[PDB]
Design a protein around this ligand. Structure first.
Ligand SMILES: [Ca+2]
Ligand SMILES: [Ca+2]
Ligand SMILES: [Ca+2]
Ligand SMILES: [Ca+2]
Ligand SMILES: [Cl-]
Lengths: 290, 290
């Protein structure tokens, strides 16, 4: 029944946003004569963005998810908004914010979005999230980024737990799985690779959330990394553990533990020469953000 | 055969740009095994934008129109470009220029258009006209406006001539026709109105090009006019000849002759009370730019 595990990822890559929200959502609240509104839980959301008993629902005849207002619940319009935040890289937001900020006053408002919207013709659902429901709000690169991080943090924590950590730690294989799921890459090789982790790491104290988050923060800035290498005249250079740690530190301001690197090399080092070629890791992770 | 005169205006309002260029163009040059390229003359262009013996073409087996490069001839891509310039009001260009000018360096380039283009998805034919064929050019509100005026001047001159002026002058009826064509308004009333001009102006020394251009410059800023009235606490106020002349002067920096006003009042003053109500003139002319 892996034909399904596969199937579900196709929906996750190749499918209307509606088809997806609907497929992973578990709540359906009806309030006659109103319409049915479908809802996700935070866990429904996270499963919807990451591979590997009841849709319940209630009916009337007649953590930044609490932020949504629906008491932790997530509506489709929430889905779109969150989905979009998560998938909009800092650099992109920064330009787009630029072009929107018409008077260049460091902010962005409804009137301006208003104007720009038109000039486009000559993304309408998100307006309340950006400028409140009053629409008299003002959006800031800093605000938004602050928020993007919280969202990524909370989502990644939910993901961590989805592995049932023990005293704050998951296994190396569980971690390798998170990486492989993240890579969005399907290969028998890496798959065989990811299984041998528990054997490669027969002891394994595991990875704490901090260790895992640190690495995903690095994954978050993997484009900058390639720029950093090129700058030092080393474009497409193979990574060794110490070099990976130096860049992660330089372009993401984090300290990657030796153990994290151990696992990441053990999983991605497909030719077994001890270092990660561009095609083996950066290429793939760079690709994971289009 | 007015059923046609009518027909042709529908094409001019309700029709693919292609259908139009093709319908009014007179030249078709073929260079086997190349494709046929259709061409307008400057006069073909002007007729295409204004109501009321041979399409010739040559074939090989085997004034800002000279600016186009095709030696006065106008291609479809030229058509689009010119068409668009003519129909893009100063204020609109100014904002749109704003949002495009990303580094706010007073210019606009290919890289920037490039960036903005994407962010749009996340108007391709005009690129060479704006940034040259090298695309290394830079667009300026001032450049573009300078150009917009020349274009409007040259088009309006061509239109003037399309009435066979005598010693630099056309008739009041001919003028009234230009206004009525411009208004894009079809009514039996104003039509009856426009005919009685030669009788209302039995002498008539006529209108010189300067007189006509001055008024079309005013028509060009008719939105600002309504703003000017509102500002002085007179929104939607009826115009008398002297008031029309004061605003034309204030918001378009032109001196409208008494005679021009005479004709414009004689044509638009449908109730015959001697003054132009908002619905009688400004409303209509404001409307003529969406
Ligand atoms: Ca702003
Ligand atoms: Ca390797
Ligand atoms: Ca610029
Ligand atoms: Ca009147
Ligand atoms: Cl801007």
């Amino acid at each position: 029944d892996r034909k399904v595990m596969e199937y579900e990822n196709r929906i996750r890559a190749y499918s209307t946003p509606d088809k997806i929200f609907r497929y992973f959502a578990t709540l359906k609240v009806i309030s006659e004569p109103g319409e049915a509104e479908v809802f996700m839980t935070p866990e429904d959301f996270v499963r919807s963005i990451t591979p590997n008993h009841l849709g319940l629902d209630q009916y009337i005849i007649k953590s930044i998810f609490y932020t949504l207002g629906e008491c932790g619940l997530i509506s489709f319009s929430d889905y779109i908004f969150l989905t979009t935040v998560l998938s909009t890289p800092q650099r992109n937001f920064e330009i787009a914010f630029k072009m929107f900020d018409l008077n260049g006053d460091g902010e962005v408002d409804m009137e301006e979005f208003e104007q720009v919207q038109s000039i486009i013709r000559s993304c309408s659902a998100l307006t309340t999230y950006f400028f409140g429901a009053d629409l008299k709000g003002k959006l800031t690169i800093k605000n938004f980024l602050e928020f993007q991080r919280k969202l990524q943090h909370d989502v990644l924590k939910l993901e961590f737990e989805r592995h049932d950590p023990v005293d704050g730690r998951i296994t190396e294989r569980q971690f390798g799985g998170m990486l492989l799921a993240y890579s969005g890459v399907q290969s028998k090789k890496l798959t065989a690779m990811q299984r041998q982790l528990k054997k490669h790491f027969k002891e394994g104290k595991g990875l704490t959330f901090q260790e895992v988050e640190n690495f995903f923060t690095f994954l978050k800035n993997i484009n900058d990394v390639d720029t950093a290498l090129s700058f030092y005249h080393m474009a497409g250079a193979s990574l060794d553990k110490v070099t990976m740690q130096q860049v992660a530190r330089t372009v993401a301001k984090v300290e990657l533990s030796d153990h994290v690197c151990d696992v990441v090399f053990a999983l991605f080092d497909c030719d077994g020469n001890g270092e990660l070629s561009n095609k083996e890791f950066v290429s793939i992770m760079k690709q994971r953000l289009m």
